[PDB]
Design a protein around this ligand. Sequence first.
Ligand SMILES: Nc1ncnc2c1ncn2[C@@H]1O[C@H](COP(=O)(O)OP(=O)(O)OP(=O)(O)O)[C@@H](O)[C@H]1O
Ligand SMILES: Nc1ncnc2c1ncn2[C@@H]1O[C@H](COP(=O)(O)OP(=O)(O)O)[C@@H](O)[C@H]1O
Ligand SMILES: [Mg+2]
Lengths: 889, 393, 284, 387
Amino acid sequence: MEEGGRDKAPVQPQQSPAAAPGGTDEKPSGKERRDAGDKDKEQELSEEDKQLQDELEMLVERLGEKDTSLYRPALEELRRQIRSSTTSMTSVPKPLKFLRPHYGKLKEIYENMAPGENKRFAADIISVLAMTMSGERECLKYRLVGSQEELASWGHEYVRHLAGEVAKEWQELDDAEKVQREPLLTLVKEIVPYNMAHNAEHEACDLLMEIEQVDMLEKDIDENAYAKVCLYLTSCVNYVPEPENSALLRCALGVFRKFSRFPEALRLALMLNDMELVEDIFTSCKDVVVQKQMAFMLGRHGVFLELSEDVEEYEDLTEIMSNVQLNSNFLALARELDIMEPKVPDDIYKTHLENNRFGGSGSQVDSARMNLASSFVNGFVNAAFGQDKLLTDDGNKWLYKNKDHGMLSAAASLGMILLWDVDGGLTQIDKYLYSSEDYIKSGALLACGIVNSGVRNECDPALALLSDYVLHNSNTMRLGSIFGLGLAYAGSNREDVLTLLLPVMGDSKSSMEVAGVTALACGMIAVGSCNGDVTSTILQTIMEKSETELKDTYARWLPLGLGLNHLGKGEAIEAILAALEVVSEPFRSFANTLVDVCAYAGSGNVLKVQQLLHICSEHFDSKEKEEDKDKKEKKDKDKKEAPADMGAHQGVAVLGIALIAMGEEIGAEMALRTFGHLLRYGEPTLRRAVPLALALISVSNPRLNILDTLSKFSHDADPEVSYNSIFAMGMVGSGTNNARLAAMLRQLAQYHAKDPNNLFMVRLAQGLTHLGKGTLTLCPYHSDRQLMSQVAVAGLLTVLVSFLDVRNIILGKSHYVLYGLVAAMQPRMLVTFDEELRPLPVSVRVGQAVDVVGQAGKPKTITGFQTHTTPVLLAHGERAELATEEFLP
Amino acid sequence: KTYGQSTYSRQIKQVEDDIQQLLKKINELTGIKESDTGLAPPALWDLAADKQTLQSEQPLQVARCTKIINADSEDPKYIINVKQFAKFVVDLSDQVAPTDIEEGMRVGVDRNKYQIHIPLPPKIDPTVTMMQVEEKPDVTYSDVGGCKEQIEKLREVVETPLLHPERFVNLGIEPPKGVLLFGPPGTGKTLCARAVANRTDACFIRVIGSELVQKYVGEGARMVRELFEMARTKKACLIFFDEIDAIGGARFDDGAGGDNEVQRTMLELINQLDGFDPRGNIKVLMATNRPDTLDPALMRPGRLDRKIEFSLPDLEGRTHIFKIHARSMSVERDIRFELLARLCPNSTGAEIRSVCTEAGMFAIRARRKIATEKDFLEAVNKVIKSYAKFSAT
Amino acid sequence: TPNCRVALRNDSYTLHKILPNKVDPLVSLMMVEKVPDIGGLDKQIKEIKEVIELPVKHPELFEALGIAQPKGVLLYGPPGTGKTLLARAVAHHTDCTFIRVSGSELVQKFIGEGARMVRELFVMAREHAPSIIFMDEIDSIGSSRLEGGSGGDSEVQRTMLELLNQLDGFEATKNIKVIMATNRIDILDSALLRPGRIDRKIEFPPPNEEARLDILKIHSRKMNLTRGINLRKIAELMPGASGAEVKGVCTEAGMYALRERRVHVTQEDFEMAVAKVMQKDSEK
Amino acid sequence: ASKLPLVTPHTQCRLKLLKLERIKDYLLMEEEFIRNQEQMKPLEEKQEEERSKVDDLRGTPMSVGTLEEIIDDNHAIVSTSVGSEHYVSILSFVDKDLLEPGCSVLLNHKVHAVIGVLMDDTDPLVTVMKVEKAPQETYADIGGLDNQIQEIKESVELPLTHPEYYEEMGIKPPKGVILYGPPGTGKTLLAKAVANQTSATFLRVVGSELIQKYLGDGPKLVRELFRVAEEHAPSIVFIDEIDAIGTKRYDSNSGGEREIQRTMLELLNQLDGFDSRGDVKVIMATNRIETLDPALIRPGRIDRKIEFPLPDEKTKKRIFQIHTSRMTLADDVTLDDLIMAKDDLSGADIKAICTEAGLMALRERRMKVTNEDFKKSKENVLYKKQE
Ligand SMILES: Nc1ncnc2c1ncn2[C@@H]1O[C@H](COP(=O)(O)OP(=O)(O)OP(=O)(O)O)[C@@H](O)[C@H]1O
Ligand SMILES: Nc1ncnc2c1ncn2[C@@H]1O[C@H](COP(=O)(O)OP(=O)(O)O)[C@@H](O)[C@H]1O
Ligand SMILES: [Mg+2]
């Protein structure tokens, strides 16, 4: 404790500052020159961030409280001369002379008045005098004033200029780290009116720095991972023009302004498609911006590139629609055949070879329904790229043997065989078509739409499945003919043929299991804020289901075609439109929870989550709205995959404690679809916790629910070491978990991961985290999986080709115009970085290094090295163009 | 007392904290059985405690492990010891194929009838299991700038034949499997080791030079046996030694009662390195600070082929290392380092990082966000004078 | 209680009855507290009077100057040399309950009770009365430092670590001291025990004529002797004689009384015993 | 327990407020939904049903075994107390996370299956080497050090206490610290002082104890030392007296000296060779400083070399005042008689003085203090240095 003798600051600034009645009066040099000399001594000595207890900042205030208390809070004759060296050293050490209630009266000391500007003497500062003061303003005072009456006198005018200097001031001491701290000021300042702050912050950033656009930019998107309902709406459209005005990246326009297409209104990114047609700069970044526009997050954008520029800068359109899709063909065309793919691996039905030597002899498993899974040994494995000439003779005999829905099934696996095909997919179907069969014809033809899906080249706009539908007096001629064209034309929202199949629902002909999948199929073309098909459906709903609703074939298929396409929207109006037309009773009100959160896919609304559990938790009303709470928990399944890790940990904490530990029918029947929709890559946490409720099937229930969860627990990153789990559960499931209902199921899930050994992308995630269909096609399976004989008759149409919106797998590709390059890549882990510093490592697993077609994987954000020039997009996406250049290598 | 550094300073802090504690209070409120002397929490073994543990009970017996000696003619007729129990003439169970039961094998056999059930992985002790790195630190080749000749020479040896076993066949040559590194300390050898191990694409094996000296005779050699065994097993694996001076530096015999055991061990490394049926696909990287007092047997080529050294940067290696250790840190846009390196005529990359991190300590003590450029000026000044009147120098 | 026998089943190994211990081995080998009642040893007596008799009678002095009263003591000299019994008496001079600790090697191997042989000993010291404890070369012979460290711990240096575990407490001696006398003083961990724990050592100079005379009576004390003898002449017949050796002198004289065919320990016996004992002392 | 990994803002960003408010509302929702379980159907079929069922499934006579190897998922190889090694499968009941080789286990009688695991003991090494508690006086015991205290503080204390400067720039702190100067300076004082006022573990090490009659353990002691210090907790390692054990290769001889060269070698590579230790504080004490190995001297290993000067008449008046604070003092004495006379006397010498008073006055059993007590005491220490 070395004090006393050297407390000059605690003496001269403790005497002259003390006697203002003696200093301000009767001593002009005493009030003026000693206070000014205490303003350069305190501004230069007690005014910078240096420690807790400065020579003055803590020491001149210990008795400097009353010392400051009467030097100039009370003279009542203040002039335009005694405001520079009078509020001169009393004003700076204010925040620690007073106490925590300084936020209400934080305007009398340094918010009172500075001599000219905050930087006139707060340029030699970090945050003590003026910076943290200004933050203390915009925290509380500008909010309470800016709630209702902003423009009063001085809490807005001086604030207007102060915000411009504080904004660049976060980058001013050093344009480096608290750059992102500035959005703590622009966001906390006028939370709702963020565009009022980002309106000046946008151009101030436009003049801020060319190199300083991307990190505070990614901090804007950082604060746009989720915000207040009016802030995710606002700061996202704020987020767009930064790479448009100051920076010029503009290849994250098409996909990362799909960030800002739907959350604002209907037409914003169609005017941003016009933005594409206005930003007609060099065609490599243009070409790859438009690459995603067909089969990477959306399609049907091929009626806007046929203007006068149709030479190459508008001839990129059809290249996107089917030609670059044809390079998706060549992907396995010349890459997977060369690397790792013969047409028929056939090692799933053969990898189950050693099991016969455990327990003695075999040949006891002779269940015919297992042959249903026998079709998927060919169906899944050829799922996109691969054919079979008499390699399908098992479906040749079993197709001509029994199991009519097995004829539809085996006929349906052919489209999975020839997927992403336009050349001969119909030529394959034609031979196996002329057999006088409804399941075979309606299955292969329905598979044809699977074949031309995302193509948009002429395959059958009205040729194949329209002619299939025009003979529909009956079975899956009437039933499955409408499914394949909606599947094929889901990515391309053509309204005409959907109007052709609107009379499918408007017919009112007996469509027991045909009408629900009708609204599902035409909904595949265009449902979701469905203007016409929601109409034609729930007209027939108020006609028939108003008077009969027993099974989920009626009730469980219509509301899906109320609000299931536009699950990327968040406006919540179509819940009002479609919902209010069916506001009758509880059973017809099972749809009430459908479109409510079907406009709530992923975002920040934990208050919507508490209204997602607290209303209907258990309630035990003796089996009346148990399905209502089952579906309400079903809507707990979304808003957990893309709140960006926010909903995941709390969903695993909640589900791991409530349902499986102490739960009800809701948990013992359906509670695993949260994992059948939540994760798609697989990790040891759920990968072990699920079989803790899976190996123990709890068959007292309709055990094919835990067996249903068996299937979609194989939903993880394609191949894994989980063959131990699935294989062992197939051995214990040989006798137990009878093959009469599970023999197709166990190998069904066994083979799903290992189908073409790649190609699982329906996660509603692209690039790093945005959205993209993945729900119209995936979801109807998990909704179609309740428990029982919907795996028997009605199910075989959906269960086979329910979800087919998988967009390949990987990104290792060159596409330099000749397409010969093999540029040195370097596989790693997903980029975990948001903000730590400037020299911050993008990934960690730098060990692996590849050059050509490889493995994307779920958590991977590979960049590469050597600067062979990745100028096309620099934001990934698996068909980079590689504009080559020697940028000082 | 304090101030509000960012607007709602405690307003997020205690709000986070009390719900964090409420996470606990949920758990103790619901009732959690903790500290049951080494078990699992009941939430996940309640639905695993069923007969799907008897599936591990009855289908899998005790399976006592034993060791194989030899076989016989026309039939297995296997001769096996248990470990210390007794030696028997036993036979395999029908669950196995009479192919992968070769001699010197650890195999699981029934306790009742003494029939072989399972082939096992051979034995490998923890003392060497722990020196296998099993991980690759993130050390990029760019971080080792300033030794362009050295990294090239090493690249020609440990990298090019492996990743491109084509040129050496098209010309008909053999790569020099034996590399030694040396030079003054604090220079870029370790860094080179970690970086090569980064892109190692191989079973890289650390070796600490003093780990071999032991209390009993020959046991250290017994280490070396397991070393070259795991090497020959793991195809295309790398070995690193470090300060091998402890091993076999000389053959002091004027008064032959000094060091002999690690001399014998060094001889074992001699034989199991080269001589009598060479190893095949293995690469050896060494490094020492005094490569002057070593037994010339290691100095013979074939074993220690290349002698790469790391020197002291004249003026420009220190510049580039200013670009290496000064890059991964926060500074103003007013950089310049030639002025710096012209001020430090003799300093290593390690001292370069010392000046870069010492740069931050001023703003760190002076309550600043980042190391401003001028603050870095102050840093190099205090390290110019500090290194000028340094304690040892 | 830990370290106790129990009746066990053979089928389920269920406890039947907690069988009683034999005897607490330290409690059956409980060190003697006999009645604490030396030509050659008088100068060091003062040194132990100041290293013991001072802080005991004078808490308030080293409290007044605030200095740790010396409790740990060390002496050094030829073998035995009254190191034992001088401590035995200094423990009594202030009524401070001598606590012998032979513990030479018989307690060093005892692994089970080696974690308590110090504990309940010191509890004895603080329970009986003001009590002085004495140590000797035993620890110096058993373990010194980490030499027998990582390679087995030797079961002894650890118990020493419990010793320092207790000395690193709060006593200020109060009136209690602990003496120690050992050869091989350059091996132990006295570096740690210097500050506060233990303190100086005092030397042994050789004995003298009247010294070995009074020794001669005190060690011819439990015998059957004769008058008509200048015993002073006898102690004067051994110029270069140590202490304990005088005890063997008395034993030799008793031997000569044995060969004299009588129980009278006469002057013949000592006059020859000086010659024989010294004759055995004739090698260097 | 690992409820949310994100700490990326490192500020009061509204991002973080949204994060912790969301996580808050989620936790409240879980606590309430589970709260409505004991409301509609408060039941207790999950405490002694599963516990009792498995307590009876597993066995009594809980034979203690030893882990040998880990294979796949459920079967591992174990070793009985005598050597009988069994290829036994484990249950999903023991913590699979705390299951590593060289660990005691619980086994069955018939199948000998792994039932449970026994928690490990506290190794004797920590008890031997670690100064268990705050041993000695706090910062009221300094005679004088301010730049020393600054260097060691911002090198260790300021980093751990306020780790909000190093992660602003991403700059890591200096690693090694050499405390050197003339003997009797107070190196032990400052080491035991920071050990007193500290929050992480502390270790004290002597160098003379690194010589075995067994051959070549040495670096065994080193490696196990740093192993325990690292594995244990945030570790503050302190090694005093490395000067008489690690100086340099003076003649490159053999026979014990070569052994010490190997040992300090292992303290070098083990000091910092590979995969940087992390949370491994290292502090080294030396008397001399020139006869040290510069390979250890270079950066990476030690970044702060602190000199220990000897004050002359300014802090000595507080050193005599501290060593005379807890003692009587007659009015016949004046500390300036001896403080105002010499200008290099070590604090160890002031200690021998203020203790020599306690020897002199109470050897004679006189009253509190006399000036000749400090006279004869100071002269006595004068012969303590001079002789
Ligand atoms: N050219 C350089 N570039 C970057 N860092 C360097 C350079 N030279 C030295 N260093 C730094 O100095 C330290 C010493 O380097 P290195 O460990 O390779 O020397 P060494 O020879 O292994 O040390 P020793 O000889 O003491 O075993 C390294 O940790 C490294 O970060
Ligand atoms: N400034 C001081 N104030 C108080 N005591 C001191 C001072 N300087 C030295 N000493 C005493 O001198 C002794 C020397 O300590 P230290 O330098 O650690 O020993 P060594 O030099 O043998 O390592 C300390 O134990 C302390 O009691
Ligand atoms: Mg090295």
